[PDB]
């Protein structure tokens, strides 16, 4: 994706700069297919010398944007585009990327010796980067009102208002204007909510202390802060303005609310005198913006200080919020499938309108008044209540998230309508965060004998000191806190650390034990190292702990027991986790991981949540494949699978040995060809090579893949990208820090143990359970059908309104003004709002929701309903001949004053019943929501509607003048009315109960259809070929 930067600097004398004022309004045209003359809009072709107007040809892009002057105050031009910053380059033409050729590399000599910049005209530094603040642009209320009024639907509504005012019917104009006003207010509220909810994330500026060269200390606002400037921690407590790199010493930082898991991770200063450092090593020795600081070691005299390196929208914090405003990537699904339906509706409306206008023109009716009546008839195509009512269902559904989970920020909620896959993480979702001590086995005194494994503090020796000082706990005037596994290890020995006054243990029988250096437990290396020294020791002793798989390789080959595989896999069958320890007396950074020697093994317990099995079993009944991603040891998921019954009938995996270039990887039977009928398990090391090697096997192997072992976090993004390329919609659950990498844009997922008002991802709930997945699934699926229901209701209402208006026009009689309102005010908006109040159904959907509209069955059902409605109930023209009445005074005035007309009264009375019965029947449905009576507001609304409607058919009382109703000659004439209305009532249910049946599919059970969709062909080939 690239494009040129051509433009015309001024090319304006004009003198024609004013002739275009009266020209046609062209902005709307340029938004779609700008080839119609976008260049004519003050965009002549010219060179790239000082271009005031910068535009991109979008040769390989489907969108374009324009940015303009001015630059502040050699002088280098700059502009702001989507939050990115660029600066002019003198040596070359055009602009260049920000950070002045740094790209993470710079002269470390002067940079390390940060003596403080001596005010070298800081204005230049400010121009390139700008103020060190983040402020998402916010538009004023009039700005948001005016810029949202260009929608063509609103223009059509305004034209309808103007026409209704012109035709001497201002009452309808008032109702249309009120509808437009409510639409405007609800749109303004929707636009506000997101902005005013995401605005709180913008941390306010605060006073900070910054040091100057020569020993001068001054307090300045955080705005003045610039990258590469001095920055001193505030009294070892507070908040950080932006990211920075520690100059020296050790510091403690947390990223609970910004990255995920709240467990503190130790931080150490970056190596000195090495060279340029890229972003890969930043995480090891980089800070984060808006993070609390616990304590820092004051190894050197002067207090701890840091230097900022990143600022503005290019910071790590800014990247996550960059997705806000401009969507990236664009919406997965585009609703371009209703073209056939809208074309059919338009052609039907045109046919009806031409028939009606011809009928009206007949009978020697004046031609002058035909045009206005035809316009009124055709205005029924798009009532003003459509946009307002269609856009409120999502907002009403969003109210559920406030009460019940998940706690999300809005439009992307519909991406889960047609999901067919789900993923889970075993790190903390399927097991409790805390670990239970089970036992430990030493490897001293006996060369290789197993001895007796049990957790006891009685034995003493190097193992005691290794376990005592192997952790990353943090303390603040209370008991130590940190990773649950570390505190579980340390509590076994019972030793405590309290106030060197911070690197010395307590209650040491043999000799006090101290520590020299401490490192975190980053999952990248899945291991940690520590140096342990005690007084009187000949030399310091180093200790390293980590996964048993890799410790053996780096250790002395002739130290491990011959049957170490049996020892390590004995506890695997029980579902427990095992770790290995090592030590070596290294005499006086990567050098400390040399020929180490293992010292022992430790086994922990990972209890499974009792509530995982039933929810998973219930979710397994929807015929959706489930996969797991984790970097644990070989197998160890058999117990979990048995608990949730995924591989209960059969299970198999793939060999791990793939070192040889031949990569001969035959299948394994766990507990011959490879039909892959059973469930296959992959491995991290194998997945890292099989993806690029033998690509033809990837499509037919990824489908059967269920679990992964010893896989690095870097493969998650690749895995999700591959699944997306395979046209697979899947979700995953995150519970740690190395889980949000794949949540950026590929594709969706869930999180666990997250704080409120999360902005990193549109998740999650507050409960620390995987029970939210059924909740989000069911709420989403019940939300999908709301759009279909409202579309059906709107279409049927439009069809009946059109048929009524065109049939009524058989003669000069015309309906008044308040008659239209009596329906448009309490039959359209009320029910539209009420239907949005539905809720999810307790029973999980057995089948996936309908694919999409339009479809043959729904068209057949709706056309059948329309023909039935337009059928027998039109007997008001024929059956009336059997009762006394007088013919209307046709032609008498051709005005709506014909109050005593008989046909108008009956049609108006039955129109409300038709509308309400259609609304009730269209919303009927057993799955995806509870029955209609579950909603109390809807019951009261329909009850009062029926109570007030039935009063009109009953002998009218006093105060009936404004309604223009007329008395009935015979009180018994209502027998036909009640009979026909009850017949329609029963028929609606009778037809709805049979049309929902599979008859549309029953008539084509001998289907020759063969739909692949890139999902069925693979499995068909797999089952056909062994």
CSV table of N, CA, C and O in Angstrom, one decimal, residues 85-167:
chain,number,residue,atom,x,y,z
A,85,UNK,N,3.3,12.0,13.0
A,85,UNK,CA,4.1,13.2,12.9
A,85,UNK,C,5.2,12.9,11.8
A,85,UNK,O,5.8,11.9,11.8
A,86,UNK,N,5.4,13.9,11.0
A,86,UNK,CA,6.4,13.9,9.9
A,86,UNK,C,7.2,15.2,9.9
A,86,UNK,O,6.6,16.3,10.3
A,87,UNK,N,8.4,15.2,9.5
A,87,UNK,CA,9.2,16.4,9.4
A,87,UNK,C,9.9,16.5,8.1
A,87,UNK,O,10.4,15.4,7.5
A,88,UNK,N,10.0,17.7,7.5
A,88,UNK,CA,10.7,17.9,6.2
A,88,UNK,C,12.2,17.5,6.4
A,88,UNK,O,12.8,17.8,7.4
A,89,UNK,N,12.8,17.0,5.3
A,89,UNK,CA,14.2,16.7,5.2
A,89,UNK,C,14.8,17.6,4.2
A,89,UNK,O,14.4,17.6,3.1
A,90,UNK,N,15.9,18.3,4.6
A,90,UNK,CA,16.6,19.2,3.7
A,90,UNK,C,17.4,18.4,2.6
A,90,UNK,O,17.4,18.8,1.4
A,91,UNK,N,18.1,17.4,3.0
A,91,UNK,CA,19.0,16.7,2.1
A,91,UNK,C,18.2,16.0,1.0
A,91,UNK,O,18.7,16.0,-0.2
A,92,UNK,N,17.1,15.4,1.3
A,92,UNK,CA,16.2,14.8,0.3
A,92,UNK,C,15.0,15.7,0.1
A,92,UNK,O,14.7,16.7,0.8
A,93,UNK,N,14.1,15.3,-0.9
A,93,UNK,CA,12.9,15.9,-1.1
A,93,UNK,C,11.8,15.3,-0.3
A,93,UNK,O,12.0,14.3,0.4
A,94,UNK,N,10.6,15.9,-0.3
A,94,UNK,CA,9.5,15.4,0.4
A,94,UNK,C,9.8,15.4,1.9
A,94,UNK,O,10.8,16.1,2.4
A,95,UNK,N,9.0,14.7,2.7
A,95,UNK,CA,9.1,14.7,4.2
A,95,UNK,C,9.8,13.3,4.5
A,95,UNK,O,10.2,12.5,3.7
A,96,UNK,N,10.0,13.1,5.8
A,96,UNK,CA,10.7,11.9,6.3
A,96,UNK,C,10.1,11.5,7.7
A,96,UNK,O,9.5,12.4,8.4
A,97,UNK,N,10.3,10.3,8.0
A,97,UNK,CA,9.7,9.7,9.3
A,97,UNK,C,10.3,10.4,10.5
A,97,UNK,O,11.5,10.9,10.5
A,98,UNK,N,9.6,10.5,11.6
A,98,UNK,CA,9.9,11.2,12.8
A,98,UNK,C,11.0,10.5,13.5
A,98,UNK,O,11.4,9.4,13.1
A,99,UNK,N,11.6,11.2,14.5
A,99,UNK,CA,12.7,10.7,15.4
A,99,UNK,C,14.1,10.9,14.8
A,99,UNK,O,15.0,10.3,15.4
A,100,UNK,N,14.2,11.6,13.7
A,100,UNK,CA,15.5,12.1,13.2
A,100,UNK,C,16.5,10.9,13.1
A,100,UNK,O,17.5,10.8,13.8
A,101,UNK,N,16.1,10.0,12.2
A,101,UNK,CA,17.0,8.9,11.8
A,101,UNK,C,17.4,8.0,12.9
A,101,UNK,O,18.4,7.2,12.8
A,102,UNK,N,16.6,8.0,14.0
A,102,UNK,CA,17.0,7.2,15.2
A,102,UNK,C,16.7,5.7,14.9
A,102,UNK,O,17.6,4.9,14.9
A,103,UNK,N,15.4,5.4,14.7
A,103,UNK,CA,14.9,4.1,14.4
A,103,UNK,C,15.5,3.1,15.5
A,103,UNK,O,15.7,1.9,15.2
A,104,UNK,N,15.6,3.6,16.7
A,104,UNK,CA,16.1,2.7,17.8
A,104,UNK,C,17.6,2.7,17.9
A,104,UNK,O,18.1,2.0,18.8
A,105,UNK,N,18.3,3.3,17.0
A,105,UNK,CA,19.8,3.3,17.0
A,105,UNK,C,20.3,4.7,17.1
A,105,UNK,O,19.8,5.6,16.5
A,106,UNK,N,21.3,4.9,18.0
A,106,UNK,CA,21.9,6.2,18.1
A,106,UNK,C,23.3,6.0,18.9
A,106,UNK,O,23.6,4.9,19.4
A,107,UNK,N,24.1,7.1,18.8
A,107,UNK,CA,25.4,7.1,19.5
A,107,UNK,C,25.2,7.0,21.0
A,107,UNK,O,24.7,7.9,21.7
A,108,UNK,N,25.5,5.8,21.6
A,108,UNK,CA,25.3,5.6,23.0
A,108,UNK,C,26.3,6.3,23.9
A,108,UNK,O,26.0,6.4,25.1
A,109,UNK,N,27.4,6.8,23.3
A,109,UNK,CA,28.4,7.4,24.2
A,109,UNK,C,27.8,8.7,24.9
A,109,UNK,O,27.7,8.7,26.1
A,110,UNK,N,27.4,9.7,24.1
A,110,UNK,CA,26.8,10.9,24.7
A,110,UNK,C,25.5,10.6,25.3
A,110,UNK,O,25.1,11.1,26.3
A,111,UNK,N,24.7,9.7,24.6
A,111,UNK,CA,23.4,9.4,25.2
A,111,UNK,C,23.4,8.8,26.6
A,111,UNK,O,22.7,9.2,27.4
A,112,UNK,N,24.4,7.9,26.8
A,112,UNK,CA,24.5,7.3,28.1
A,112,UNK,C,25.0,8.4,29.1
A,112,UNK,O,24.4,8.4,30.2
A,113,UNK,N,25.9,9.2,28.7
A,113,UNK,CA,26.4,10.3,29.6
A,113,UNK,C,25.5,11.5,29.5
A,113,UNK,O,25.9,12.6,29.0
A,114,UNK,N,24.2,11.4,29.9
A,114,UNK,CA,23.2,12.4,29.8
A,114,UNK,C,23.6,13.5,30.9
A,114,UNK,O,23.2,13.3,32.1
A,115,UNK,N,24.2,14.5,30.5
A,115,UNK,CA,24.6,15.6,31.4
A,115,UNK,C,23.6,16.8,31.4
A,115,UNK,O,23.7,17.7,32.1
A,116,UNK,N,22.5,16.6,30.6
A,116,UNK,CA,21.5,17.7,30.6
A,116,UNK,C,21.7,18.6,29.4
A,116,UNK,O,22.8,19.3,29.3
A,117,UNK,N,20.7,18.8,28.5
A,117,UNK,CA,20.8,19.7,27.4
A,117,UNK,C,20.9,21.1,27.9
A,117,UNK,O,20.1,21.5,28.7
A,118,UNK,N,21.8,21.9,27.3
A,118,UNK,CA,22.0,23.3,27.7
A,118,UNK,C,21.1,24.3,26.9
A,118,UNK,O,21.6,25.3,26.4
A,119,UNK,N,19.8,24.0,26.9
A,119,UNK,CA,18.8,25.0,26.3
A,119,UNK,C,19.3,25.4,24.9
A,119,UNK,O,19.6,26.6,24.7
A,120,UNK,N,19.4,24.5,24.0
A,120,UNK,CA,19.9,24.7,22.6
A,120,UNK,C,18.7,25.1,21.7
A,120,UNK,O,18.5,24.6,20.7
A,121,UNK,N,18.0,26.2,22.1
A,121,UNK,CA,16.8,26.7,21.4
A,121,UNK,C,15.8,25.5,21.3
A,121,UNK,O,15.4,25.1,20.2
A,122,UNK,N,15.3,25.2,22.4
A,122,UNK,CA,14.3,24.0,22.5
A,122,UNK,C,13.1,24.2,21.6
A,122,UNK,O,12.4,23.2,21.3
A,123,UNK,N,12.9,25.4,21.1
A,123,UNK,CA,11.7,25.6,20.2
A,123,UNK,C,11.8,24.6,19.0
A,123,UNK,O,10.8,24.2,18.5
A,124,UNK,N,13.0,24.4,18.5
A,124,UNK,CA,13.2,23.4,17.4
A,124,UNK,C,12.7,22.0,17.8
A,124,UNK,O,12.0,21.3,17.1
A,125,UNK,N,13.1,21.6,19.0
A,125,UNK,CA,12.6,20.3,19.5
A,125,UNK,C,11.1,20.3,19.7
A,125,UNK,O,10.5,19.2,19.4
A,126,UNK,N,10.5,21.3,20.1
A,126,UNK,CA,9.1,21.4,20.3
A,126,UNK,C,8.4,21.2,19.0
A,126,UNK,O,7.3,20.6,18.8
A,127,UNK,N,8.9,21.9,17.9
A,127,UNK,CA,8.2,21.9,16.6
A,127,UNK,C,8.2,20.5,16.0
A,127,UNK,O,7.2,20.0,15.5
A,128,UNK,N,9.3,19.7,16.2
A,128,UNK,CA,9.3,18.4,15.5
A,128,UNK,C,8.4,17.4,16.2
A,128,UNK,O,7.7,16.6,15.6
A,129,UNK,N,8.2,17.5,17.6
A,129,UNK,CA,7.4,16.6,18.3
A,129,UNK,C,6.1,17.2,18.8
A,129,UNK,O,5.1,16.5,19.0
A,130,UNK,N,6.1,18.5,19.1
A,130,UNK,CA,4.9,19.2,19.6
A,130,UNK,C,4.8,19.0,21.1
A,130,UNK,O,5.7,18.4,21.7
A,131,UNK,N,3.7,19.5,21.7
A,131,UNK,CA,3.5,19.3,23.1
A,131,UNK,C,3.4,17.9,23.5
A,131,UNK,O,2.9,17.0,22.8
A,132,UNK,N,4.0,17.6,24.7
A,132,UNK,CA,4.0,16.2,25.2
A,132,UNK,C,2.7,15.8,25.9
A,132,UNK,O,2.7,15.5,27.1
A,133,UNK,N,1.6,16.0,25.2
A,133,UNK,CA,0.2,15.7,25.7
A,133,UNK,C,-0.5,14.9,24.7
A,133,UNK,O,-0.2,15.0,23.5
A,134,UNK,N,-1.6,14.2,25.1
A,134,UNK,CA,-2.5,13.5,24.3
A,134,UNK,C,-3.9,14.1,24.4
A,134,UNK,O,-4.4,14.1,25.6
A,135,UNK,N,-4.4,14.5,23.3
A,135,UNK,CA,-5.8,15.1,23.3
A,135,UNK,C,-6.5,14.7,22.1
A,135,UNK,O,-6.3,15.3,21.0
A,136,UNK,N,-7.4,13.7,22.2
A,136,UNK,CA,-8.2,13.3,21.0
A,136,UNK,C,-9.1,14.5,20.6
A,136,UNK,O,-9.7,15.1,21.5
A,137,UNK,N,-9.1,14.9,19.3
A,137,UNK,CA,-10.0,16.0,19.0
A,137,UNK,C,-11.4,15.8,19.4
A,137,UNK,O,-12.0,14.7,19.2
A,138,UNK,N,-12.0,16.9,19.9
A,138,UNK,CA,-13.4,16.9,20.3
A,138,UNK,C,-14.1,18.0,19.6
A,138,UNK,O,-13.6,19.2,19.7
A,139,UNK,N,-15.3,17.8,19.0
A,139,UNK,CA,-16.0,18.8,18.3
A,139,UNK,C,-17.2,19.3,19.2
A,139,UNK,O,-17.8,18.5,20.0
A,140,UNK,N,-17.5,20.6,19.1
A,140,UNK,CA,-18.5,21.2,19.9
A,140,UNK,C,-19.9,20.7,19.4
A,140,UNK,O,-20.0,20.1,18.4
A,141,UNK,N,-20.9,20.9,20.3
A,141,UNK,CA,-22.2,20.4,20.0
A,141,UNK,C,-22.7,20.9,18.6
A,141,UNK,O,-23.2,20.1,17.8
A,142,UNK,N,-22.6,22.2,18.3
A,142,UNK,CA,-23.0,22.6,17.0
A,142,UNK,C,-22.2,22.0,15.9
A,142,UNK,O,-22.7,21.7,14.8
A,143,UNK,N,-20.9,21.8,16.1
A,143,UNK,CA,-20.1,21.1,15.1
A,143,UNK,C,-20.6,19.7,14.8
A,143,UNK,O,-20.6,19.3,13.7
A,144,UNK,N,-20.9,19.0,15.9
A,144,UNK,CA,-21.4,17.6,15.7
A,144,UNK,C,-22.8,17.6,15.1
A,144,UNK,O,-23.1,16.7,14.4
A,145,UNK,N,-23.6,18.6,15.4
A,145,UNK,CA,-24.9,18.7,14.8
A,145,UNK,C,-24.9,19.0,13.3
A,145,UNK,O,-25.6,18.3,12.5
A,146,UNK,N,-24.1,20.0,12.9
A,146,UNK,CA,-24.0,20.4,11.5
A,146,UNK,C,-23.4,19.3,10.6
A,146,UNK,O,-23.9,19.0,9.5
A,147,UNK,N,-22.3,18.7,11.1
A,147,UNK,CA,-21.5,17.8,10.3
A,147,UNK,C,-22.2,16.5,10.1
A,147,UNK,O,-21.8,15.7,9.3
A,148,UNK,N,-23.3,16.2,10.8
A,148,UNK,CA,-24.1,15.0,10.7
A,148,UNK,C,-25.4,15.2,10.0
A,148,UNK,O,-26.2,14.3,9.9
A,149,UNK,N,-25.6,16.4,9.4
A,149,UNK,CA,-26.9,16.7,8.7
A,149,UNK,C,-26.8,16.5,7.2
A,149,UNK,O,-27.7,16.9,6.5
A,150,UNK,N,-25.7,16.0,6.7
A,150,UNK,CA,-25.5,15.8,5.3
A,150,UNK,C,-26.0,14.4,4.8
A,150,UNK,O,-25.9,14.1,3.6
A,151,UNK,N,-26.6,13.6,5.6
A,151,UNK,CA,-27.1,12.3,5.2
A,151,UNK,C,-28.2,12.5,4.2
A,151,UNK,O,-29.1,13.4,4.4
A,152,UNK,N,-28.2,11.8,3.1
A,152,UNK,CA,-29.3,11.9,2.1
A,152,UNK,C,-30.7,11.6,2.7
A,152,UNK,O,-31.7,12.2,2.2
A,153,UNK,N,-30.8,10.7,3.7
A,153,UNK,CA,-32.1,10.4,4.2
A,153,UNK,C,-32.7,11.6,4.9
A,153,UNK,O,-33.9,11.9,4.8
A,154,UNK,N,-31.9,12.4,5.6
A,154,UNK,CA,-32.3,13.6,6.3
A,154,UNK,C,-32.8,14.7,5.3
A,154,UNK,O,-33.8,15.4,5.5
A,155,UNK,N,-32.1,14.8,4.2
A,155,UNK,CA,-32.5,15.7,3.1
A,155,UNK,C,-33.8,15.3,2.5
A,155,UNK,O,-34.7,16.1,2.3
A,156,UNK,N,-34.0,14.0,2.3
A,156,UNK,CA,-35.3,13.5,1.8
A,156,UNK,C,-36.4,13.8,2.8
A,156,UNK,O,-37.5,14.2,2.4
A,157,UNK,N,-36.1,13.6,4.1
A,157,UNK,CA,-37.1,13.9,5.1
A,157,UNK,C,-37.5,15.4,5.1
A,157,UNK,O,-38.6,15.8,5.3
A,158,UNK,N,-36.5,16.3,5.0
A,158,UNK,CA,-36.7,17.7,4.9
A,158,UNK,C,-37.6,18.0,3.7
A,158,UNK,O,-38.5,18.9,3.8
A,159,UNK,N,-37.3,17.4,2.6
A,159,UNK,CA,-38.1,17.6,1.4
A,159,UNK,C,-39.5,17.2,1.6
A,159,UNK,O,-40.5,17.9,1.2
A,160,UNK,N,-39.7,16.1,2.3
A,160,UNK,CA,-41.1,15.6,2.6
A,160,UNK,C,-41.8,16.6,3.5
A,160,UNK,O,-43.0,16.9,3.3
A,161,UNK,N,-41.1,17.1,4.5
A,161,UNK,CA,-41.7,18.2,5.4
A,161,UNK,C,-42.1,19.4,4.6
A,161,UNK,O,-43.2,19.9,4.7
A,162,UNK,N,-41.2,19.8,3.6
A,162,UNK,CA,-41.6,21.0,2.8
A,162,UNK,C,-42.8,20.7,2.0
A,162,UNK,O,-43.7,21.5,1.8
A,163,UNK,N,-42.9,19.5,1.4
A,163,UNK,CA,-44.0,19.2,0.5
A,163,UNK,C,-45.3,19.1,1.4
A,163,UNK,O,-46.3,19.6,0.9
A,164,UNK,N,-45.2,18.5,2.5
A,164,UNK,CA,-46.4,18.4,3.4
A,164,UNK,C,-46.9,19.8,3.9
A,164,UNK,O,-48.1,20.0,4.0
A,165,UNK,N,-45.9,20.7,4.1
A,165,UNK,CA,-46.3,22.1,4.4
A,165,UNK,C,-46.9,22.7,3.2
A,165,UNK,O,-47.9,23.5,3.4
A,166,UNK,N,-46.4,22.5,2.0
A,166,UNK,CA,-46.9,23.1,0.8
A,166,UNK,C,-48.3,22.7,0.5
A,166,UNK,O,-49.2,23.5,0.1
A,167,UNK,N,-48.7,21.4,0.8
A,167,UNK,CA,-50.0,20.8,0.4
A,167,UNK,C,-51.0,21.1,1.5
A,167,UNK,O,-52.0,20.4,1.5
